[PDB]
Amino acid sequence: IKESYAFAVLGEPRYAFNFNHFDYVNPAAPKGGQITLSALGTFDNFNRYALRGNPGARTEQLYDTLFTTSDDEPGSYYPLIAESARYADDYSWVEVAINPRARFHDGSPITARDVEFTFQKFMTEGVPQFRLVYKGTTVKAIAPLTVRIELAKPGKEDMLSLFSLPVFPEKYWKDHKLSDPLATPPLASGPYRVTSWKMGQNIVYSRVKDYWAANLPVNRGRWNFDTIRYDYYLDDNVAFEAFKAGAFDLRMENDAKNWATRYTGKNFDKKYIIKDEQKNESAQDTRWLAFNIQRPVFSDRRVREAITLAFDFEWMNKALFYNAWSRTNSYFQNTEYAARNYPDAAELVLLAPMKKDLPSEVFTQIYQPPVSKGDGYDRDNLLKADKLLNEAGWVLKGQQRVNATTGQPLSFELLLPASSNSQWVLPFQHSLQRLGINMDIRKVDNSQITNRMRSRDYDMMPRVWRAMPWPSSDLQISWSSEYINSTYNAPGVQSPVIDSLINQIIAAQGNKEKLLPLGRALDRVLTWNYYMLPMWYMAEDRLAWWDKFSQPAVRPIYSLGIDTWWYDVNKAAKLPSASKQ
Amino acid sequence: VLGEPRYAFNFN
Ligand SMILES: [Cl-]
Numbered sequence: 001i002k003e004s005y006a007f008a009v010l011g012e013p014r015y016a017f018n019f020n021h022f023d024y025v026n027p028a029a030p031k032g033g034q035i036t037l038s039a040l041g042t043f044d045n046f047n048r049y050a051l052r053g054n055p056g057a058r059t060e061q062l063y064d065t066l067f068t069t070s071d072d073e074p075g076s077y078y079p080l081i082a083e084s085a086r087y088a089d090d091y092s093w094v095e096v097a098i099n100p101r102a103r104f105h106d107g108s109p110i111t112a113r114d115v116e117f118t119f120q121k122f123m124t125e126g127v128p129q130f131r132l133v134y135k136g137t138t139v140k141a142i143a144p145l146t147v148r149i150e151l152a153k154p155g156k157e158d159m160l161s162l163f164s165l166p167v168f169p170e171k172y173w174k175d176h177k178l179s180d181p182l183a184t185p186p187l188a189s190g191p192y193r194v195t196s197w198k199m200g201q202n203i204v205y206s207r208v209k210d211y212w213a214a215n216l217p218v219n220r221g222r223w224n225f226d227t228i229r230y231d232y233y234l235d236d237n238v239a240f241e242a243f244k245a246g247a248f249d250l251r252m253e254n255d256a257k258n259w260a261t262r263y264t265g266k267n268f269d270k271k272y273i274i275k276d277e278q279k280n281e282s283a284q285d286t287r288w289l290a291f292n293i294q295r296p297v298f299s300d301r302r303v304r305e306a307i308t309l310a311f312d313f314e315w316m317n318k319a320l321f322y323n324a325w326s327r328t329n330s331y332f333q334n335t336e337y338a339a340r341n342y343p344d345a346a347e348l349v350l351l352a353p354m355k356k357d358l359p360s361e362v363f364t365q366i367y368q369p370p371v372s373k374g375d376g377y378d379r380d381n382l383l384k385a386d387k388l389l390n391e392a393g394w395v396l397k398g399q400q401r402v403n404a405t406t407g408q409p410l411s412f413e414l415l416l417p418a419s420s421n422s423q424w425v426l427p428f429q430h431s432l433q434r435l436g437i438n439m440d441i442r443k444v445d446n447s448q449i450t451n452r453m454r455s456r457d458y459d460m461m462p463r464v465w466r467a468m469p470w471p472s473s474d475l476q477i478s479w480s481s482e483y484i485n486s487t488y489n490a491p492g493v494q495s496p497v498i499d500s501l502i503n504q505i506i507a508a509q510g511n512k513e514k515l516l517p518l519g520r521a522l523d524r525v526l527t528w529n530y531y532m533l534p535m536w537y538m539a540e541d542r543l544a545w546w547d548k549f550s551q552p553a554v555r556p557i558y559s560l561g562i563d564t565w566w567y568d569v570n571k572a573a574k575l576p577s578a579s580k581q
Numbered sequence: 582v583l584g585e586p587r588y589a590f591n592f593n
């Protein structure tokens with residue numbers, strides 16, 4: 001039986017038990033001031049954990065958890081509600097000691113019974129994947145401030161995942177179904193509390209100035225602003241112009257042409273607005289176009305390959321995007337687990353038993369999305385697309401691509417959020433037309449796209465694959481057969497090859513020597529099957545803000561660290577007064 | 582954060 005104050009998914013946590021604060025904070029950061037942010041689309045309720053609805057910005061952060069993660073490590077956990085934990089070396093059980101100072105916003109204590117209540121609330125009224133993941137687990141208050149967690153199989157990551165479960169107050173949540181949207185904020189506990197809102201338009205968070213955990217090491221130097229306000233915009237172009245007029249304080253710029261040509265005006269000449277390009281060498285979010293492979297039009301890997309050949313990234317980057325983007329090419333982008341080289345011996349051991357069910361390129365080639373000459377008319381790529389289509393039974397009848405048996409035109413719908421800039425869409429549609437393929441474009445509002453995304457009610461739609469710094473057991477939610485309805489399986493894949501590799505990843509959790517070939521092997525399977533069409537990423541954060549903030553000397557690796565920023569009185573005094581807005 | 586897709590439906 002061991003006792004610890006910190007845990008890490010791989011290796012050891014960076015911060016010793018006696019640590020005072022994170023390397024990437026200023027412990028003396030002053031409190032006060034407001035930061036105003038934007039959000040795209042709309043929202044209709046306050047329950048992030050419901051089975052439906054459009055949850056408001058930041059409503060995933062309303063609650064403290066047992067342990068909280070550092071932002072400069074891939075997965076290290078430090079005390080928040082918990083003070084410590086005793087556990088067996090096989091990570092099949094843990095007893096978590098609750099800090100007696102822990103409180104909800106109404107001043108009532110957070111107890112072991114609240115943790116037990118919360119686990120059962122998610123098991124019985126949470127999203128379906130929760131009960132599937134935790135079917136073999138129990139969470140029990142064995143003393144007023146000690147929760148015991150027991151797993152049916154050794155599962156370090158299952159255990160640490162529950163360390164991030166929001167701890168609900170039973171006194172409130174006994175009267176609200178977890179699956180139902182909430183028209184008003186729930187009783188919560190975190191350092192910021194919703195204090196006003198306008199449904200669909202804005203949410204205002206206020207700093208909880210007697211926050212019980214304000215001086216814990218994980219919170220020192222953080223949560224400095226007195227007010228965090230989110231204003232919603234239906235149109236990113238409207239949001240961008242509002243930023244430049246001073247309507248909100250900080251913008252993450254995802255539009256290449258905006259960044260290249262439109263950060264102009266006397267607010268920039270007067271140096272009221274700062275631009276920063278922060279390069280990062282860590283795991284990267286990546287953009288893809290999901291093929292719904294449960295729909296007949298995309299059931300054939302050859303058709304998915306042909307449509308991928310029609311996506312001229314080199315032309316798009318040069319002509320539309322100021323060559324800002326890099327091509328997506330891995331589900332572990334910019335990490336050690338990306339399959340950037342030929343398979344090594346250990347990978348071949350894992351893959352050879354499944355060769356009957358694998359594309360042969362998994363063994364013979366390094367995955368590379370198509371490269372075009374960059375003029376929109378890459379002859380080699382488009383002739384190969386035509387041959388793949390022909391071989392798949394989709395032949396030309398005149399200028400139209402039709403099924404060689406039924407005569408049905410090859411046609412599919414691209415589902416798009418109306419809020420996003422999508423300058424690549426007509427170029428893609430034009431390239432497809434030149435293969436005889438019709439792509440209908442359907443732009444829909446924020447709530448509709450959320451509902452349709454969740455149900456996979458699309459032929460194709462853009463998806464973000466969030467940065468995964470190591471092959472996590474969470475891969476099963478997005479890819480394994482049993483979790484098909486989690487809302488995270490974008491292509492709709494149920495493959496025994498994927499299932500077996502992810503089962504091995506889970507059995508090898510914590511073991512980096514084993515996870516390295518397994519992650520690379522899984523990358524090969526997911527990429528070579530063309531389940532999605534790789535779009536782009538960039539290994540940098542393009543940020544602009546009104547010059548009213550100061551920052552710690554060190555930025556975290558895995559977050560922008562805006563929660564470590566503070567309102568700088570000296571800097572703000574030179575800006576025009578917010579009374580003009 | 583580890584475990585988020587276990588707790589909630591996808592958004593955005
Ligand atoms: Cl600092």
Ligand SMILES: [Mg+2]
Binds near residue numbers: 129
């Ligand atoms: Mg289900």
